[PDB]
Amino acid sequence: AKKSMIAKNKRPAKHSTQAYTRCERCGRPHSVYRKFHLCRICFRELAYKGQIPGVKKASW
Amino acid sequence: GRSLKKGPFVDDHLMKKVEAQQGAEKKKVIKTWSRRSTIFPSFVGFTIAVYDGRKHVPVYIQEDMVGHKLGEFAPTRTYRGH
Amino acid sequence: GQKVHPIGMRVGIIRDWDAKWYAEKEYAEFLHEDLRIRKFIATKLADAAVSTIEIERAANRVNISIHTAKPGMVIGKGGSEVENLRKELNKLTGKRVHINIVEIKKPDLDAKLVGEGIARQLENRVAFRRAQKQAIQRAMRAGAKGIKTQVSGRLNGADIARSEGYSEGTVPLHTLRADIDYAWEEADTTYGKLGVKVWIYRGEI
Amino acid sequence: IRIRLKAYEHRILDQSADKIVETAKRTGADVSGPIPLPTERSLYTVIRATHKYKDSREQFEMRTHKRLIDIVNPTPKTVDALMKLDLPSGVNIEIK
Amino acid sequence: PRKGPVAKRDVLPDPIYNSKLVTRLINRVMVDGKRGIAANIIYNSFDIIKESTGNDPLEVFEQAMKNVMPVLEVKARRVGGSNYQVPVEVRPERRTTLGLRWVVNYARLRGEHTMEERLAKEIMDAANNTGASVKKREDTHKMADANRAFAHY
Amino acid sequence: VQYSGTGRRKNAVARVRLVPGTGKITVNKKDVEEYIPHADLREVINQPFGVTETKGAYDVIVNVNGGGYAGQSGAIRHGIARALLQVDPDFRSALKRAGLLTRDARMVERKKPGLKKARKASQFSKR
Amino acid sequence: RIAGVDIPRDKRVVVSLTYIYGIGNTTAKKVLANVGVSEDVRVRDLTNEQTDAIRAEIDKLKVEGDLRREVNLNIKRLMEIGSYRGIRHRRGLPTRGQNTKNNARTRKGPTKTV
RNA sequence: UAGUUGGGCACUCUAGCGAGACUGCCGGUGACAAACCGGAGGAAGGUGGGGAUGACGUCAAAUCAUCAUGCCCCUUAUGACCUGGGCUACACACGUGCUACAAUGGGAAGUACAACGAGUCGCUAGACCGCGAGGUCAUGCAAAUCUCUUAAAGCUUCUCUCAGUUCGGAUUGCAGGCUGCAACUCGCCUGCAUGAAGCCGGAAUCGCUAGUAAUCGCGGAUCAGCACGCCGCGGUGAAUACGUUC
Ligand SMILES: [K+]
Ligand SMILES: [K+]
Ligand SMILES: [K+]
Ligand SMILES: [K+]
Ligand SMILES: [K+]
Ligand SMILES: [K+]
Ligand SMILES: [K+]
Ligand SMILES: [K+]
Ligand SMILES: [K+]
Ligand SMILES: [K+]
Ligand SMILES: [K+]
Ligand SMILES: [K+]
Ligand SMILES: [Mg+2]
Ligand SMILES: [Mg+2]
Ligand SMILES: [Mg+2]
Ligand SMILES: [Mg+2]
Ligand SMILES: [Mg+2]
Ligand SMILES: [Mg+2]
Ligand SMILES: [Mg+2]
Ligand SMILES: [Mg+2]
Ligand SMILES: [Mg+2]
Ligand SMILES: [Mg+2]
Ligand SMILES: [Zn+2]
């Protein structure tokens, strides 16, 4: 049901609060960063690849 | 709770049905999915079959019942005990 | 135990962002644009030995440096092939796409290229041991200070999956100064997916 | 003239700042700076695993170094000179 | 720990009585790092001590420490299938520790409404050689004597 | 003539300035007692004079900011020691052996992930 | 005493008035402000005329049996209409939306270990 | 009136380049070493403190529900659209936390010191209304420039006086605020009303060796609305380490 959910999420929502954010890379609904529009999994995956500008391992 | 400025709330379709039935000698059951509707003094005198998640339960309206959401008068889930 | 991604570990120490551009309000749109561009380029030039894609952004322009071991193949005759790619990318993105090509000297020392080659062979039903060994020899001849490779899955279609790996030289993943290239590729077989990992250590930085 | 530069890497930021200062200084207008500003930092934490395993985490820091330049007595040539000096995509530049 | 004895952190003497012992007492009474309340209560208690007895509160407190500080403690030791206590001389650091610990514990148990009042009452009794703190010290010495047959361990 | 100095402790940083006087100490335009109402902290501040035998010799004007009162008290002490060294190098021996020169580097240990504090861990149940 | 409840005598007047059912700390302060009586003075020292004025204020208020009957009428009203709230009252369960898998002891009663 | 204005960057601060800590030097032990003990200097001495970093492997551990995927099953249905409902149930059992059981305290008043981070239709100054939640007008700020944001413990006065209380803040009635089409199922917050259990906790059990524990606030990610959770920050700040028998 992932594809149908993805398509419906893309479509405009009937009411404002209905609109919800998915990971545009995989469609995962939960833990979707607004800054990157990616889930945590996809974000961490791409960040390791180095294809998310600016991001890097945090340490202090 | 609900802001006073916004005024009372009720679904438009439900409101239209009650208004059309206002001049009715014998009120007929109003089948509604709308739990959100607030009850109104005009609503008094009617029986409303409110959806409970699996069927429309009829509930009779009266002056005491006014001022509350319809869905409250129709319990969703059933629990008998252990 | 698990290990940090070899590239992601050194990103910012000696490795740099492949998406080389800066933005604040269009970060999301530009990142999604980059992802779609990468996907389309990978699908289009799968045959070509395309390893690295670097994106730079200046106003509405987008510069794309594509590294390949077959620059002739990617360009085509008289710039024909790259021009067609540019037009398709313009349609996809909606903005000017400047394209640059780079010749990958020593493809044997590239993680993704070596891994993809092993994946092709596994799809072709070569002995995985032979594939990894000859890949290692090519890398060592190319001059890697070290190489390491691993293939995991239902080897030979076996019911119980396992992992077989080889290495030569030195591949100190923990040493941060060390320039250790890494890449992961999946070789899809009749029995499912087989995962190939390659670590290549060149002269440290 | 006031110029704000932002970059994820201080090295290219400094290189571009030197370029701006040299071109402005070459054009003759006086230059004030480069003035470092507090590098902005954002942090994001994600569960290292893909399922359960809440305790094990990983944290990612995005750093934005910013430099400020103030060019005094701007000559007419300086404005075009600074509009011609093109910095890499890795540095974001703001003028006034 | 396993490696060996560690270095001990020192404490600067008191601002108004200029002694490390008073500061140790302040830290002892301290709760949740609210050293301001701790030191205020200690000073109020010493004022009450001077009031109820024109003597030096510092001298009274030293007398209370000498009265409560144990000499022979009992350390539990397991011998085969039987475990029993063994008498042991108390190193001076633990002596002061036990004195301050007992005083504060028993002072907190007292029935007076305010802590400084309770502490003052307990300190005076200890200086007088009476009260729960001296009672605890007597019990420890009494237990040491009872199990004294195990001293050879 | 004013002898300057700087002290740091936790997140508190103090710019100290000695002017010869009666030992009156003003911090951020207010007296030590007004600002630091804790006698313990005030005595900590005054330690350098006691070790260097310069009691009451110099009044101090300190501009300090950041951190809490106790941290700022430590920072004030460090700045005063540095200012005394400026006044006289020969104070170095006494100041060092008292450790006033040494920079107290103990900072706030960061919170670890998964751990409710720098070292506190969730309550553990075996089963 | 005031409305038929012997408020504590030694305590301060504010707290003594609170001991009245239907009167909280805020209402106690308000009535003392109206009457002009200091909040610190104890009731045992309060003069009789002050007591009469305070009684007049309270009489204006609605408290004690009146308040209990009013609130119980509301609860009775819920139950008689048979609302969800009425059934919550009827079965002694949290009415304001609390979870019941755990806690809910206040409404439910003591634990029945079964 | 204001570091305001003029003026200067000296100091702090900011962020680049650097220097520094390397058992580097002295003494002692040592098998001529390794190394260990101490000293000097020095801000830091022996890894200075903390983070990242997780070897070959182990548990057919977890994940076919992030994703991908062999094979098997459904294909007018296990696929798809809409409304409503549930995941929030509730005799009980367990884990993890929040608040408490009070005077090292509660209440009233005064007064002082942080850091980390967030803000465009968002942070929002100031002012008007409102007891409050907030409403109105309206300002600056895409931000070391304005705002969120005068932090809480603290310290200094007044009150309470050992009371299941002026502790407690559960439960419940009424009346409001917001967000949203919508607050009943089923949000948060506020005022009035009420004041539950709870008097320091059986067997057993958890964390921690220092700016740690303990204790106090602050920011943020998700986010129309919603945290006692999580990430991070700063304030105050201990006791103890005898020792390796269990
Ligand atoms: K989401
Ligand atoms: K519930
Ligand atoms: K529970
Ligand atoms: K510097
Ligand atoms: K799947
Ligand atoms: K599958
Ligand atoms: K359990
Ligand atoms: K909790
Ligand atoms: K008080
Ligand atoms: K609701
Ligand atoms: K307990
Ligand atoms: K929120
Ligand atoms: Mg939502
Ligand atoms: Mg009352
Ligand atoms: Mg609820
Ligand atoms: Mg290591
Ligand atoms: Mg299994
Ligand atoms: Mg599937
Ligand atoms: Mg659930
Ligand atoms: Mg009690
Ligand atoms: Mg340890
Ligand atoms: Mg802290
Ligand atoms: Zn994703």
Coordinates of C-alpha atoms in Angstrom, one line a residue, chain C residues 6-8 11-12 19 33 42 44 51 71 76 90 94 109 112 130 135-136 143 152 154 156-157 161 171 179 184 194:
Chain C
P6 CA 34.2 4.4 5.4
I7 CA 33.3 7.5 3.3
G8 CA 30.9 9.1 5.7
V11 CA 33.5 13.3 5.0
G12 CA 34.8 16.7 6.2
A19 CA 27.0 17.9 -3.7
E33 CA 16.7 17.8 -7.5
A42 CA 22.7 6.3 -13.0
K44 CA 21.0 6.3 -18.3
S51 CA 31.6 6.4 -10.6
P71 CA 34.5 9.5 -21.4
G76 CA 29.5 10.0 -27.9
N90 CA 16.9 20.2 -18.6
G94 CA 13.6 22.9 -15.5
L109 CA 41.4 1.8 -7.8
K112 CA 32.3 1.7 -7.2
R130 CA 37.9 -16.0 -8.8
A135 CA 39.8 -7.8 -8.9
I136 CA 42.3 -7.7 -6.1
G143 CA 48.9 0.5 -7.1
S152 CA 27.5 -11.9 0.8
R154 CA 23.3 -17.3 -1.3
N156 CA 26.2 -20.6 -5.7
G157 CA 22.5 -20.6 -4.8
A161 CA 23.9 -17.5 3.0
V171 CA 43.1 -1.2 4.8
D179 CA 42.2 7.7 2.1
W184 CA 28.6 -1.1 -2.1
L194 CA 24.1 -10.6 -3.4

